[PDB]
């Protein structure tokens, strides 16, 4: 068990917004993605608009100031750092993707659920039904649900 947040109230901040989507749909997708994990743990997530948040959400392209460049359209979608100070927790989404609320392009909500998993300390699962499986695939977002493996993983860290 590597790093974990040692506190229940976690803050996030949207550094910048992708032009691919309506602003309120970015807010909603990110908020919903946090709720997925707060529904199975004692963690509480609050959006802040100024100051240092635990989890900074960034849309960036190519080389963006960390040692982990993005690759243009396709390939890598996003990445996140495990719990820690500074860049720890932060979630970066490749702006060269086309982010959406639906099945077109790459679904922001689903990607965010996977990346926040990493921000909370989760690795990857070998279970293709898990949100933490290392392969993106679209599933109807209105019906989405964590797998038993994802729940066991997060509860092993927090509950
Ligand atoms: C079920 O919903 C899901 C949604 C998204 C994903 C998902 C799958 C792949 C990526 S990915 O970006 O194609 C990817 C691919 C291979 C290894 C690692 C990754 C990234 C990290 C990329 C980096 O180091 O810069 C990751 O796992 O977070 C991102 C997100 C998986 C499942
Ligand atoms: Ca951080
Ligand atoms: Ca890419
Ligand atoms: Ca884009
Ligand atoms: Zn990055
Ligand atoms: Zn991953």
Coordinates of N, CA, C and O and ligand atoms in Angstrom, one line a residue:
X1 N 0.9 -1.2 0.0 CA 0.0 0.0 0.0 C 0.9 1.2 0.0 O 1.5 1.5 1.0
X2 N 1.0 1.9 -1.1 CA 1.8 3.1 -1.2 C 1.1 4.3 -0.6 O 0.3 4.2 0.4
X3 N 1.2 5.5 -1.1 CA 0.6 6.7 -0.4 C -0.9 6.8 -0.5 O -1.6 6.3 -1.4
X4 N -1.4 7.3 0.6 CA -2.8 7.5 0.8 C -3.0 8.9 1.4 O -2.1 9.4 2.2
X5 N -4.2 9.6 1.2 CA -4.5 10.8 1.9 C -4.8 10.4 3.3 O -5.6 9.4 3.5
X6 N -4.3 11.2 4.3 CA -4.5 10.9 5.7 C -5.6 11.8 6.3 O -5.3 12.4 7.4
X7 N -6.5 12.2 5.5 CA -7.5 13.2 5.9 C -8.8 12.9 5.1 O -8.7 12.3 4.0
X8 N -10.0 13.3 5.6 CA -11.3 12.9 4.9 C -11.7 14.0 4.1 O -12.5 13.7 3.2
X9 N -11.4 15.3 4.3 CA -11.9 16.4 3.5 C -10.8 16.8 2.5 O -9.7 17.2 2.9
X10 N -11.1 16.5 1.2 CA -10.1 16.7 0.1 C -10.6 17.9 -0.8 O -11.9 18.0 -0.9
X11 N -9.8 18.7 -1.3 CA -10.2 19.7 -2.1 C -9.6 19.5 -3.6 O -8.6 18.9 -3.7
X12 N -10.4 20.0 -4.5 CA -9.9 20.0 -5.9 C -10.1 21.4 -6.5 O -11.0 22.1 -6.1
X13 N -9.4 21.7 -7.6 CA -9.6 22.9 -8.3 C -9.4 22.7 -9.7 O -8.5 21.9 -10.1
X14 N -10.2 23.2 -10.6 CA -10.1 23.1 -12.1 C -9.2 24.2 -12.5 O -9.6 25.4 -12.5
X15 N -8.0 23.9 -12.9 CA -7.0 25.0 -13.2 C -7.4 25.7 -14.5 O -7.2 26.9 -14.6
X16 N -8.0 25.0 -15.5 CA -8.3 25.5 -16.8 C -9.3 24.6 -17.4 O -9.4 23.4 -17.0
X17 N -10.1 25.1 -18.3 CA -11.1 24.3 -18.9 C -10.9 24.0 -20.4 O -10.4 24.8 -21.2
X18 N -11.2 22.7 -20.8 CA -11.0 22.4 -22.2 C -12.1 23.1 -23.0 O -13.3 23.2 -22.7
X19 N -11.7 23.7 -24.2 CA -12.6 24.3 -25.1 C -13.6 23.3 -25.8 O -14.4 23.7 -26.6
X20 N -13.3 21.9 -25.7 CA -14.1 20.9 -26.3 C -15.5 20.8 -25.8 O -16.3 20.1 -26.4
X21 N -15.7 21.3 -24.5 CA -17.0 21.1 -23.8 C -17.6 22.5 -23.3 O -16.8 23.4 -23.1
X22 N -18.8 22.4 -22.9 CA -19.4 23.5 -22.2 C -18.7 23.5 -20.8 O -18.5 22.5 -20.2
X23 N -18.6 24.7 -20.2 CA -17.9 24.9 -18.9 C -18.7 24.1 -17.9 O -18.1 23.4 -17.1
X24 N -20.0 24.2 -17.9 CA -20.8 23.6 -16.8 C -20.7 22.0 -17.0 O -20.9 21.4 -16.0
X25 N -20.5 21.5 -18.2 CA -20.4 20.1 -18.4 C -19.1 19.5 -17.9 O -19.0 18.4 -17.4
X26 N -18.0 20.3 -18.0 CA -16.7 20.0 -17.4 C -16.9 19.9 -15.9 O -16.5 19.0 -15.2
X27 N -17.5 21.0 -15.3 CA -17.7 21.0 -13.8 C -18.5 19.7 -13.5 O -18.2 19.1 -12.4
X28 N -19.6 19.5 -14.1 CA -20.4 18.3 -13.8 C -19.7 17.0 -13.9 O -19.8 16.1 -13.0
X29 N -19.0 16.8 -15.0 CA -18.3 15.5 -15.2 C -17.3 15.3 -14.1 O -17.2 14.2 -13.5
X30 N -16.5 16.3 -13.7 CA -15.5 16.2 -12.7 C -16.2 15.9 -11.3 O -15.8 15.0 -10.5
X31 N -17.3 16.7 -11.0 CA -18.0 16.5 -9.7 C -18.6 15.1 -9.6 O -18.4 14.5 -8.6
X32 N -19.2 14.6 -10.7 CA -19.7 13.3 -10.7 C -18.6 12.2 -10.5 O -18.9 11.2 -9.8
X33 N -17.5 12.4 -11.1 CA -16.4 11.5 -11.0 C -15.9 11.4 -9.5 O -15.6 10.3 -9.0
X34 N -15.8 12.6 -8.8 CA -15.4 12.5 -7.4 C -16.5 11.8 -6.7 O -16.2 11.1 -5.7
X35 N -17.8 12.0 -7.0 CA -18.9 11.4 -6.2 C -18.8 9.9 -6.3 O -19.2 9.2 -5.3
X36 N -18.4 9.3 -7.4 CA -18.2 7.9 -7.6 C -17.4 7.3 -6.4 O -17.7 6.3 -5.8
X37 N -16.3 8.0 -6.1 CA -15.4 7.5 -5.1 C -15.8 7.9 -3.6 O -15.7 7.2 -2.7
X38 N -16.4 9.1 -3.5 CA -17.0 9.5 -2.2 C -18.1 8.6 -1.8 O -18.4 8.3 -0.6
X39 N -18.8 7.9 -2.7 CA -20.0 7.1 -2.4 C -19.5 5.8 -1.8 O -20.4 5.1 -1.2
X40 N -18.3 5.4 -1.9 CA -17.8 4.1 -1.3 C -16.7 4.3 -0.3 O -16.0 3.3 0.1
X41 N -16.5 5.5 0.2 CA -15.4 5.8 1.2 C -15.9 6.9 2.1 O -17.0 7.5 1.9
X42 N -15.1 7.2 3.1 CA -15.5 8.3 4.0 C -15.0 9.7 3.5 O -15.1 10.7 4.2
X43 N -14.4 9.7 2.3 CA -13.9 11.0 1.7 C -14.9 11.9 1.3 O -16.0 11.5 0.8
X44 N -14.7 13.2 1.4 CA -15.5 14.3 1.0 C -14.7 15.2 0.1 O -13.6 15.5 0.4
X45 N -15.2 15.6 -1.0 CA -14.5 16.4 -2.1 C -15.2 17.7 -2.2 O -16.4 17.8 -2.4
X46 N -14.4 18.8 -2.2 CA -15.0 20.2 -2.3 C -14.2 20.9 -3.4 O -13.0 20.9 -3.4
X47 N -15.0 21.5 -4.3 CA -14.4 22.3 -5.3 C -13.9 23.7 -4.8 O -14.8 24.3 -4.1
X48 N -12.8 24.2 -5.0 CA -12.4 25.5 -4.6 C -11.9 26.2 -5.9 O -11.5 25.6 -6.9
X49 N -12.0 27.6 -5.8 CA -11.7 28.4 -7.0 C -10.5 29.2 -6.8 O -10.0 29.8 -7.8
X50 N -9.8 29.2 -5.7 CA -8.6 29.9 -5.4 C -7.9 29.1 -4.4 O -8.5 28.4 -3.6
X51 N -6.6 29.4 -4.3 CA -5.8 28.8 -3.3 C -5.3 27.4 -3.8 O -5.5 27.0 -5.0
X52 N -4.5 26.8 -3.0 CA -3.9 25.5 -3.3 C -4.9 24.4 -2.9 O -5.4 24.3 -1.8
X53 N -5.3 23.6 -3.9 CA -6.1 22.4 -3.6 C -5.3 21.2 -3.5 O -4.1 21.2 -4.0
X54 N -5.8 20.2 -2.9 CA -5.1 18.9 -2.9 C -4.9 18.4 -4.4 O -3.9 18.0 -4.7
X55 N -6.0 18.4 -5.1 CA -6.1 17.7 -6.5 C -6.3 18.9 -7.4 O -7.4 19.4 -7.6
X56 N -5.3 19.2 -8.2 CA -5.4 20.2 -9.3 C -5.7 19.4 -10.6 O -5.0 18.5 -11.0
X57 N -6.8 19.8 -11.3 CA -7.2 19.3 -12.5 C -6.8 20.2 -13.7 O -7.1 21.4 -13.6
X58 N -6.0 19.7 -14.6 CA -5.4 20.5 -15.6 C -5.7 19.9 -17.0 O -5.6 18.6 -17.2
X59 N -6.0 20.7 -18.0 CA -6.0 20.2 -19.4 C -4.8 20.8 -20.1 O -4.5 22.0 -20.0
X60 N -3.9 19.9 -20.6 CA -2.6 20.3 -21.2 C -2.3 19.5 -22.4 O -2.8 18.4 -22.5
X61 N -1.3 19.9 -23.2 CA -0.9 19.1 -24.3 C 0.6 19.0 -24.4 O 1.3 19.8 -23.8
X62 N 1.1 17.9 -25.0 CA 2.5 17.7 -25.2 C 3.3 17.8 -23.9 O 2.9 17.2 -22.8
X63 N 4.5 18.4 -23.9 CA 5.3 18.6 -22.7 C 4.7 19.7 -21.9 O 4.5 20.8 -22.4
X64 N 4.3 19.5 -20.7 CA 3.6 20.4 -19.9 C 4.1 20.6 -18.5 O 3.3 21.0 -17.6
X65 N 5.4 20.4 -18.3 CA 6.0 20.8 -17.0 C 6.2 19.7 -16.0 O 6.6 20.0 -14.9
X66 N 5.8 18.5 -16.3 CA 6.1 17.4 -15.5 C 7.0 16.5 -16.5 O 7.2 16.8 -17.7
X67 N 7.5 15.4 -16.0 CA 8.4 14.7 -16.7 C 7.6 13.7 -17.7 O 8.3 13.0 -18.4
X68 N 6.3 13.9 -17.8 CA 5.5 12.9 -18.5 C 4.6 13.6 -19.6 O 3.5 13.9 -19.4
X69 N 5.3 13.7 -20.7 CA 4.6 14.4 -21.8 C 3.4 13.6 -22.4 O 3.4 12.4 -22.3
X70 N 2.4 14.4 -22.9 CA 1.5 13.8 -23.7 C 1.9 13.7 -25.2 O 2.9 14.2 -25.6
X71 N 1.1 13.0 -25.9 CA 1.5 12.4 -27.2 C 0.6 12.8 -28.4 O 0.7 12.0 -29.5
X72 N -0.1 13.8 -28.3 CA -1.0 14.2 -29.4 C -2.3 13.4 -29.3 O -2.6 12.6 -28.4
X73 N -3.1 13.6 -30.4 CA -4.3 12.9 -30.4 C -4.1 11.4 -30.4 O -3.3 10.9 -31.3
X74 N -4.9 10.6 -29.7 CA -4.8 9.2 -29.6 C -3.8 8.8 -28.5 O -3.2 9.7 -27.8
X75 N -3.5 7.5 -28.4 CA -2.6 7.1 -27.4 C -3.1 7.4 -26.0 O -4.2 7.2 -25.6
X76 N -2.1 8.0 -25.2 CA -2.4 8.4 -23.9 C -3.6 9.4 -23.8 O -3.7 10.3 -24.6
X77 N -4.4 9.3 -22.8 CA -5.5 10.2 -22.6 C -5.3 11.2 -21.5 O -5.8 12.3 -21.5
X78 N -4.7 10.7 -20.4 CA -4.6 11.5 -19.1 C -3.7 10.8 -18.2 O -3.3 9.6 -18.4
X79 N -3.3 11.4 -17.1 CA -2.5 10.8 -16.1 C -2.7 11.5 -14.8 O -3.2 12.7 -14.7
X80 N -2.4 10.9 -13.6 CA -2.6 11.5 -12.3 C -1.5 11.0 -11.4 O -1.0 9.9 -11.5
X81 N -1.1 11.8 -10.5 CA -0.1 11.5 -9.5 C -0.8 11.0 -8.2 O -1.8 11.5 -7.8
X82 N -0.2 10.0 -7.5 CA -0.7 9.5 -6.3 C -0.6 10.6 -5.2 O 0.0 11.6 -5.3
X83 N -1.2 10.2 -4.0 CA -1.3 11.2 -2.9 C 0.0 11.7 -2.5 O 1.0 10.9 -2.3
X84 N 0.1 13.0 -2.2 CA 1.3 13.7 -1.8 C 1.1 15.2 -1.9 O 0.1 15.7 -2.4
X85 N 2.1 15.9 -1.4 CA 2.1 17.3 -1.5 C 2.5 17.8 -2.9 O 3.0 17.0 -3.7
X86 N 2.2 19.0 -3.2 CA 2.6 19.6 -4.5 C 1.8 18.9 -5.6 O 0.6 18.8 -5.6
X87 N 2.5 18.4 -6.6 CA 1.9 17.8 -7.7 C 1.2 16.5 -7.3 O 0.4 16.0 -8.1
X88 N 1.5 15.9 -6.1 CA 0.8 14.8 -5.7 C -0.7 15.0 -5.8 O -1.2 16.1 -5.5
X89 N -1.4 14.0 -6.2 CA -2.9 14.1 -6.4 C -3.3 14.7 -7.7 O -4.5 14.4 -8.1
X90 N -2.5 15.4 -8.4 CA -3.0 16.2 -9.5 C -3.3 15.3 -10.7 O -2.7 14.3 -10.9
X91 N -4.3 15.7 -11.5 CA -4.9 14.9 -12.6 C -4.8 15.8 -13.8 O -5.3 16.9 -13.9
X92 N -4.1 15.3 -14.9 CA -3.9 16.1 -16.1 C -4.5 15.3 -17.2 O -4.4 14.1 -17.4
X93 N -5.2 16.0 -18.1 CA -6.0 15.4 -19.2 C -5.4 16.0 -20.5 O -5.1 17.2 -20.6
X94 N -5.1 15.1 -21.5 CA -4.5 15.5 -22.8 C -5.5 16.4 -23.6 O -6.5 15.8 -24.1
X95 N -5.1 17.6 -23.8 CA -6.0 18.5 -24.6 C -6.1 18.1 -26.0 O -7.0 18.5 -26.8
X96 N -5.1 17.4 -26.5 CA -5.2 16.9 -27.9 C -6.2 15.9 -28.1 O -6.6 15.5 -29.2
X97 N -6.8 15.3 -27.0 CA -8.1 14.5 -27.2 C -9.2 15.5 -27.4 O -9.1 16.6 -27.0
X98 N -10.3 14.8 -27.8 CA -11.6 15.6 -27.9 C -12.5 15.1 -26.8 O -13.1 14.0 -26.9
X99 N -12.6 15.9 -25.7 CA -13.4 15.5 -24.6 C -14.9 15.7 -24.8 O -15.3 16.7 -25.4
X100 N -15.7 14.8 -24.3 CA -17.1 14.9 -24.5 C -17.9 14.4 -23.3 O -17.4 13.7 -22.4
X101 N -19.2 14.7 -23.2 CA -20.2 14.1 -22.3 C -20.8 12.8 -22.8 O -21.6 12.3 -22.0
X102 N -20.4 12.3 -23.9 CA -21.1 11.2 -24.5 C -20.2 10.2 -25.1 O -19.1 10.1 -24.6
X103 N -20.6 9.4 -26.1 CA -19.8 8.3 -26.6 C -18.8 8.8 -27.6 O -17.9 8.0 -28.0
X104 N -19.0 10.0 -28.2 CA -18.1 10.5 -29.2 C -16.8 10.9 -28.5 O -16.7 11.2 -27.3
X105 N -15.7 11.0 -29.2 CA -14.5 11.5 -28.7 C -14.1 10.6 -27.5 O -14.2 9.4 -27.6
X106 N -13.5 11.2 -26.5 CA -13.2 10.5 -25.2 C -14.0 11.1 -24.1 O -14.1 12.3 -23.9
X107 N -14.7 10.2 -23.4 CA -15.7 10.7 -22.3 C -14.9 11.2 -21.1 O -14.1 10.4 -20.5
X108 N -15.1 12.4 -20.8 CA -14.4 13.1 -19.7 C -14.7 12.4 -18.3 O -13.8 12.1 -17.5
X109 N -16.0 12.2 -18.0 CA -16.4 11.6 -16.8 C -15.7 10.3 -16.6 O -15.1 10.0 -15.5
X110 N -15.8 9.4 -17.5 CA -15.2 8.0 -17.3 C -13.7 8.1 -17.1 O -13.2 7.4 -16.2
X111 N -13.0 8.9 -17.9 CA -11.6 9.1 -17.7 C -11.2 9.7 -16.4 O -10.3 9.3 -15.7
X112 N -12.1 10.7 -16.0 CA -11.9 11.3 -14.6 C -12.0 10.3 -13.5 O -11.3 10.3 -12.5
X113 N -13.0 9.4 -13.6 CA -13.2 8.4 -12.6 C -11.9 7.5 -12.4 O -11.4 7.3 -11.3
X114 N -11.3 7.2 -13.6 CA -10.1 6.4 -13.5 C -9.0 7.2 -13.0 O -8.2 6.7 -12.1
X115 N -8.8 8.4 -13.5 CA -7.7 9.2 -13.0 C -7.8 9.6 -11.5 O -6.8 9.5 -10.8
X116 N -9.0 9.9 -11.0 CA -9.1 10.2 -9.6 C -8.8 8.9 -8.8 O -8.3 9.0 -7.7
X117 N -9.1 7.7 -9.3 CA -8.6 6.5 -8.7 C -7.2 6.6 -8.4 O -6.7 6.3 -7.2
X118 N -6.4 7.0 -9.4 CA -4.9 7.1 -9.2 C -4.6 8.2 -8.2 O -3.7 8.1 -7.3
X119 N -5.3 9.4 -8.3 CA -5.1 10.5 -7.3 C -5.3 10.0 -5.9 O -4.8 10.7 -5.0
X120 N -6.2 9.0 -5.7 CA -6.5 8.5 -4.4 C -5.5 7.4 -3.9 O -5.6 7.0 -2.7
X121 N -4.7 6.9 -4.8 CA -3.7 5.9 -4.5 C -3.9 4.5 -5.2 O -3.1 3.6 -4.9
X122 N -4.9 4.3 -6.0 CA -5.1 3.1 -6.7 C -4.2 2.9 -7.8 O -3.7 3.9 -8.5
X123 N -3.9 1.6 -8.1 CA -3.0 1.3 -9.3 C -3.9 0.8 -10.4 O -4.9 1.4 -10.8
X124 N -3.6 -0.3 -11.1 CA -4.4 -0.9 -12.1 C -4.8 -2.2 -11.8 O -4.0 -3.1 -11.2
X125 N -6.0 -2.6 -12.2 CA -6.6 -3.9 -12.0 C -6.5 -4.7 -13.2 O -6.4 -4.2 -14.4
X126 N -6.4 -6.0 -13.0 CA -6.4 -6.9 -14.2 C -7.9 -7.3 -14.6 O -8.0 -8.0 -15.6
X127 N -8.9 -6.9 -14.0 CA -10.3 -7.3 -14.2 C -10.8 -6.3 -15.2 O -10.9 -5.1 -15.0
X128 N -11.2 -6.8 -16.4 CA -11.8 -5.9 -17.5 C -13.1 -5.2 -17.1 O -13.4 -4.3 -17.7
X129 N -13.7 -5.6 -16.0 CA -14.9 -4.9 -15.6 C -14.6 -3.7 -14.7 O -15.5 -3.0 -14.4
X130 N -13.4 -3.6 -14.3 CA -13.0 -2.5 -13.3 C -12.7 -1.2 -14.0 O -12.1 -1.1 -15.1
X131 N -13.2 -0.1 -13.4 CA -12.8 1.2 -13.8 C -11.3 1.4 -13.8 O -10.8 2.2 -14.6
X132 N -10.5 0.7 -13.0 CA -9.1 0.8 -12.9 C -8.4 -0.2 -13.8 O -7.1 -0.3 -13.8
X133 N -9.1 -0.8 -14.7 CA -8.4 -1.6 -15.8 C -7.7 -0.7 -16.7 O -8.2 0.4 -16.9
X134 N -6.5 -1.0 -17.2 CA -5.7 0.0 -17.9 C -6.3 0.4 -19.4 O -5.5 1.1 -20.1
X135 N -7.5 -0.1 -19.8 CA -8.0 0.2 -21.2 C -9.3 1.0 -21.2 O -10.3 0.6 -20.6
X136 N -9.3 2.1 -21.8 CA -10.4 2.9 -21.9 C -11.5 2.1 -22.8 O -11.2 1.7 -23.9
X137 N -12.7 2.2 -22.4 CA -13.8 1.7 -23.2 C -15.0 2.5 -22.7 O -15.3 2.6 -21.5
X138 N -15.8 3.0 -23.7 CA -17.0 3.7 -23.3 C -18.1 2.7 -22.8 O -18.3 1.7 -23.3
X139 N -18.7 3.1 -21.7 CA -19.9 2.4 -21.2 C -20.9 3.5 -20.9 O -20.6 4.7 -20.5
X140 N -22.2 3.3 -21.1 CA -23.2 4.2 -20.8 C -23.0 4.9 -19.4 O -23.0 4.2 -18.4
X141 N -22.9 6.2 -19.4 CA -22.4 6.9 -18.2 C -23.6 7.1 -17.2 O -23.3 7.2 -16.0
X142 N -24.8 7.0 -17.7 CA -25.9 7.2 -16.8 C -26.1 6.0 -15.9 O -26.7 6.1 -14.9
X143 N -25.7 4.9 -16.4 CA -25.9 3.7 -15.7 C -24.5 3.2 -15.0 O -24.5 2.2 -14.4
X144 N -23.4 3.9 -15.2 CA -22.1 3.4 -14.8 C -22.1 2.9 -13.4 O -22.7 3.5 -12.5
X145 N -21.2 1.9 -13.1 CA -21.0 1.4 -11.7 C -19.6 0.8 -11.4 O -19.0 0.2 -12.3
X146 N -19.1 1.2 -10.3 CA -17.8 0.5 -9.9 C -18.0 -1.0 -9.8 O -19.1 -1.4 -9.4
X147 N -16.9 -1.7 -10.2 CA -16.8 -3.2 -9.9 C -16.5 -3.5 -8.5 O -16.1 -2.7 -7.8
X148 N -16.8 -4.7 -8.1 CA -16.5 -5.2 -6.8 C -15.0 -5.1 -6.5 O -14.6 -4.7 -5.4
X149 N -14.2 -5.3 -7.6 CA -12.7 -5.1 -7.5 C -12.3 -3.7 -7.2 O -11.4 -3.4 -6.4
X150 N -12.9 -2.7 -7.9 CA -12.6 -1.3 -7.6 C -13.0 -1.0 -6.1 O -12.4 -0.2 -5.4
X151 N -14.2 -1.5 -5.7 CA -14.7 -1.1 -4.3 C -13.7 -1.8 -3.3 O -13.4 -1.1 -2.3
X152 N -13.3 -3.0 -3.5 CA -12.4 -3.6 -2.6 C -11.1 -2.9 -2.5 O -10.5 -2.7 -1.4
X153 N -10.6 -2.4 -3.7 CA -9.3 -1.7 -3.7 C -9.4 -0.4 -3.0 O -8.6 -0.1 -2.2
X154 N -10.4 0.4 -3.3 CA -10.5 1.7 -2.6 C -10.8 1.5 -1.1 O -10.3 2.3 -0.3
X155 N -11.6 0.5 -0.7 CA -11.9 0.4 0.7 C -10.7 -0.2 1.5 O -10.6 0.1 2.7
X156 N -9.9 -0.9 0.8 CA -8.6 -1.4 1.4 C -7.6 -0.2 1.7 O -6.9 -0.2 2.7
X157 N -7.8 0.9 1.0 CA -7.1 2.1 1.3 C -7.8 3.1 2.3 O -7.0 3.7 3.1
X158 N -9.1 3.2 2.2 CA -9.8 4.2 3.0 C -10.9 3.7 4.0 O -11.3 4.6 4.8
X159 N -11.4 2.6 3.9 CA -12.6 2.2 4.7 C -12.6 1.0 5.5 O -13.7 0.4 5.8
Ligands
LIG1 C1 -13.6 2.4 -17.5 O1 -13.3 3.7 -17.7 C2 -12.0 3.8 -18.0 C3 -11.6 5.1 -18.3 C4 -10.3 5.5 -18.6 C5 -9.3 4.5 -18.6 C6 -8.0 4.9 -19.0 C7 -7.3 4.0 -19.8 C8 -6.0 4.4 -20.3 C9 -5.5 5.7 -20.1 S1 -4.1 6.0 -20.9 O2 -3.8 7.4 -20.7 O3 -4.3 5.6 -22.3 C10 -2.9 5.0 -20.2 C11 -2.7 3.9 -20.9 C12 -1.7 3.0 -20.5 C13 -1.0 3.1 -19.4 C14 -1.3 4.3 -18.6 C15 -2.2 5.2 -19.0 C16 -2.5 6.4 -18.1 C17 -1.2 7.1 -17.7 C18 -0.5 7.8 -18.9 C19 0.8 8.4 -18.6 O4 1.7 7.8 -18.0 O5 1.1 9.6 -19.0 C20 -3.3 6.0 -16.9 O6 -3.4 4.8 -16.7 O7 -3.8 6.9 -16.2 C21 -6.3 6.5 -19.3 C22 -7.5 6.2 -18.9 C23 -9.7 3.2 -18.1 C24 -11.0 2.8 -17.9
LIG2 CA1 -1.7 18.3 -5.4
LIG3 CA1 -3.0 11.6 -26.5
LIG4 CA1 -9.2 19.0 -27.1
LIG5 ZN1 1.1 15.8 -16.5
LIG6 ZN1 -4.5 4.3 -15.1

